[PDB]
Design a protein around this ligand. Structure first.
Ligand SMILES: O=C1CC[C@]2(CC(c3ccccc3Cl)=NO2)C(=O)N1
Ligand code: NA
Ligand SMILES: [Zn+2]
Length: 105
């Protein structure tokens, strides 16, 4: 379509694909302890990120998963989190939908 690739909204960095969305919903609405609301889309796969630090289970929105902050590898924009250490699946990405731009391949 014109809606197959997700890029960083701020710089255009290639991040993910609609094909790589992971449900039983791809969309999750969550709050951090600073009360910031995020509309998170779960992806099986993403690229062009920089994962910062080591995983933490603190305040994890997803039972059994530890998170690392995922920046845009290009521009440093906070795009979401990489989740690991869980089961079925072991890992995935939670990306902030409004920080991405959807478009053609
Ligand atoms: O799964 C998640 C990932 C991101 C996180 C954890 C978090 C945080 C962690 C330690 C100290 C202060 C904060 Cl503000 N903020 O957003 C969250 O709430 N849940
Ligand atoms: Na690249
Ligand atoms: Zn960017």
């Amino acid at each position: 379509p014109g809606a197959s690739i997700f890029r960083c909204r701020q710089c255009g960095q290639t991040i993910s694909r609609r094909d790589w969305l992971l449900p039983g919903d791809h969309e999750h609405v969550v709050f951090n302890p600073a009360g910031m609301i995020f509309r998170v889309w779960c992806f099986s796969l993403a690229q062009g990120l920089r994962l910062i630090g080591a995983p933490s289970g603190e305040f994890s929105w997803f039972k059994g998963y530890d998170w690392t902050i995922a920046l845009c590898g290009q521009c440093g924009s906070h795009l979401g989190w990489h989740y690991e250490g869980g089961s079925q699946p072991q890992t995935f990405f939670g990306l902030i939908k409004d920080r991405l731009a959807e478009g053609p391949a």
